[PDB]
Amino acid sequence: MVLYFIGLGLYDERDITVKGLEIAKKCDYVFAEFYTSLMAGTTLGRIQKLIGKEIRVLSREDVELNFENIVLPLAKENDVAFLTPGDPLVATTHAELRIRAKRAGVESYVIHAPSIYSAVGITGLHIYKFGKSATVAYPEGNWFPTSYYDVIKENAERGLHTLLFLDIKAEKRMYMTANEAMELLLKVEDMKKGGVFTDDTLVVVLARAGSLNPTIRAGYVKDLIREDFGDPPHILIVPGKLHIVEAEYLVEIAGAPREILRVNV
Amino acid sequence: MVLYFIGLGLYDERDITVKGLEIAKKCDYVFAEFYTSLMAGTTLGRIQKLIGKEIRVLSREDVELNFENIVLPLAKENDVAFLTPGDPLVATTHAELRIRAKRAGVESYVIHAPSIYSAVGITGLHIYKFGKSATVAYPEGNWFPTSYYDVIKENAERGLHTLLFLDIKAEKRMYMTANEAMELLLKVEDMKKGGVFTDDTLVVVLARAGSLNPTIRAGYVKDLIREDFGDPPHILIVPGKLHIVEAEYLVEIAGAPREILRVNV
Ligand SMILES: Nc1ncnc2c1ncn2[C@@H]1O[C@H](CSCC[C@H](N)C(=O)O)[C@@H](O)[C@H]1O
Ligand code: NA
Numbered sequence: 001m002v003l004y005f006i007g008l009g010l011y012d013e014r015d016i017t018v019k020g021l022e023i024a025k026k027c028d029y030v031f032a033e034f035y036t037s038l039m040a041g042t043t044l045g046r047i048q049k050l051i052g053k054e055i056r057v058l059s060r061e062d063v064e065l066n067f068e069n070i071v072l073p074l075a076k077e078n079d080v081a082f083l084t085p086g087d088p089l090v091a092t093t094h095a096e097l098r099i100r101a102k103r104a105g106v107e108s109y110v111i112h113a114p115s116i117y118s119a120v121g122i123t124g125l126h127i128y129k130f131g132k133s134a135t136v137a138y139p140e141g142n143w144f145p146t147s148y149y150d151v152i153k154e155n156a157e158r159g160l161h162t163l164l165f166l167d168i169k170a171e172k173r174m175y176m177t178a179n180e181a182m183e184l185l186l187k188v189e190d191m192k193k194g195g196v197f198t199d200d201t202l203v204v205v206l207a208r209a210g211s212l213n214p215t216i217r218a219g220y221v222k223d224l225i226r227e228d229f230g231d232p233p234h235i236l237i238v239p240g241k242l243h244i245v246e247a248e249y250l251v252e253i254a255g256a257p258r259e260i261l262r263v264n265v
Numbered sequence: 266m267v268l269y270f271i272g273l274g275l276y277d278e279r280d281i282t283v284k285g286l287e288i289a290k291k292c293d294y295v296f297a298e299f300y301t302s303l304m305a306g307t308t309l310g311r312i313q314k315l316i317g318k319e320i321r322v323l324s325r326e327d328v329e330l331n332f333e334n335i336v337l338p339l340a341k342e343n344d345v346a347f348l349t350p351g352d353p354l355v356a357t358t359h360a361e362l363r364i365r366a367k368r369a370g371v372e373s374y375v376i377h378a379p380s381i382y383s384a385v386g387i388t389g390l391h392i393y394k395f396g397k398s399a400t401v402a403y404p405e406g407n408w409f410p411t412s413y414y415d416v417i418k419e420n421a422e423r424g425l426h427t428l429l430f431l432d433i434k435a436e437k438r439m440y441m442t443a444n445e446a447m448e449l450l451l452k453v454e455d456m457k458k459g460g461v462f463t464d465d466t467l468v469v470v471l472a473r474a475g476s477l478n479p480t481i482r483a484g485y486v487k488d489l490i491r492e493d494f495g496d497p498p499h500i501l502i503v504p505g506k507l508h509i510v511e512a513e514y515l516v517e518i519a520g521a522p523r524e525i526l527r528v529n530v
Binding site: 007009010012013014015016017018019021022050086087088089090091093095096098099102109110112113114115117118119121122124126127128129130131132133134135154158160165209210212213245246248249252253 | 272274275277278279280281282283284286287315351352353354355357359360361363364367374375377378379380382383384386387389392393394395396397398399419423425474475477510513514517518
């Protein structure tokens with residue numbers, strides 16, 4: 001009688017931790033969701049093969065409206081696992097599911113896995129220097145999300161880096177590219193005119209972290225906005241004030257213009 | 266010809282990913298460092314047994330000063346792995362090691378693993394709400410550092426959470442407890458009187474993240490300062506104003522007093 005939230009990691013089925021795999025293999029029932037992120041280097045079949053169990057995939061509605069009607073009932077008399085991409089609790093609302101579990105009288109455990117939130121380290125930007133993060137959401141109808149612009153502004157004023165999660169609509173198989181995020185940010189700049197995001201802004205793009213050959217690129221928006229960063233998922237970062245070694249890494253590893261080596265203290 | 270930066274994860278030998286384990290097994294040489302952090306839930310012997318390889322431990326000096334003497338020469342004509350607790354390149358100075366490898370004509374790849382930066386999601390605090398992070402260091406001689414206090418002040422001012430790493434003498438295997446961190450912060454408050462950290466401040470303590478039985482506690486400093494959070498490592502978080510959902514999780518899962526549902530939201 002238990003429920004395990006088990007993260008599957010960044011890119012493929014092997015990004016699960018040994019702990020997560022060993023526990024999943026012993027569970028009676030295994031559910032999963034793939035709407036919170038995209039694992040571009042695997043399939044349901046490969047994951048099932050690895051854990052040696054059939055996996056029931058749930059939709060956002062199954063989870064958000066009927067988790068306690070679909071999964072919890074089984075966890076009352078069996079060992080159940082719920083798999084998610086990356087870490088199950090990062091930039092999702094899954095933490096609240098632990099409350100539902102408690103109320104169902106079901107004990108729950110969390111098995112972590114590599115998350116994009118810490119994977120940002122491969123960009124060379126010091127992780128402690130990141131400030132508030134935000135998500136660039138697709139405009140819908142007449143609704144045009146813009147709060148993420150204010151987040152960048154706030155962090156930038158403090159000299160902090162801004163991590164921008166990009167939108168996803170898994171049911172339509174829509175994954176926002178860093179290019180699309182940049183276009184939206186330029187449009188928000190045209191509206192608010194804070195001088196926060198322009199053609200001259202330095203940005204960093206990380207695509208398919210977790211793969212052996214992820215795309216890591218840094219440069220000015222005017223130069224990267226039309227660049228091909230490969231298949232999704234992508235994340236966009238707007239760095240704040242750069243330390244010398246951060247700039248050095250961006251130039252040497254992410255191909256940034258050599259002129260950024262010249263930090264403006 | 267290749268150097269693999271492989272993360273060991275959070276707490277024990279099973280926190281490495283399946284990908285990390287399989288790659289480490291194929292490497293000709295395996296190095297590791299435990300100066301950035303320790304893996305309190307395991308031993309070098311258990312990690313070696315799991316990987317089935319002899320592991321050469323490197324000191325901070327070995328890495329910071331002689332990485333190119335010790336690791337790169339071998340990576341020039343062999344497959345070499347460099348194991349680090351958590352997720353690779355999260356430690357501030359590690360990204361630069363990839364530049365060293367490039368300069369030496371050595372290819373490098375990063376194999377991610379769980380990091381405390383993302384694992385803190387188990388506290389129920391929204392990851393996007395975390396601001397700049399800091400480390401609470403022990404005062405020594407005539408040196409009494411207090412910058413971490415200012416980090417909390419600036420984050421809290423903006424409604425953001427502050428992740429506070431606690432000092433470690435990993436080489437002497439000495440950990441700073443959340444209790445000691447609280448005592449220190451109260452002293453800094455005494456000196457700065459900014460109204461940033463007091464007996465009435467709500468804090469969250471996370472101990473042994475990665476374990477199947479971590480300690481997650483939330484409450485006011487006056488009530489938690491002398492509480493036993495179990496064995497280290499401990500991390501301390503000073504949350505900013507809470508979303509009701511965050512508060513509900515802290516009450517239901519972290520045993521926080523119902524009082525936070527009206528005072529800290
Ligand atoms: N492997 C990856 N590479 C690049 N971006 C990624 C990524 N995985 C997730 N992302 C980013 O994060 C967004 C989903 S938010 C969910 C994150 C997940 N819980 C985790 O811990 O990693 C994606 O739309 C994308 O913007
Ligand atoms: Na952060």
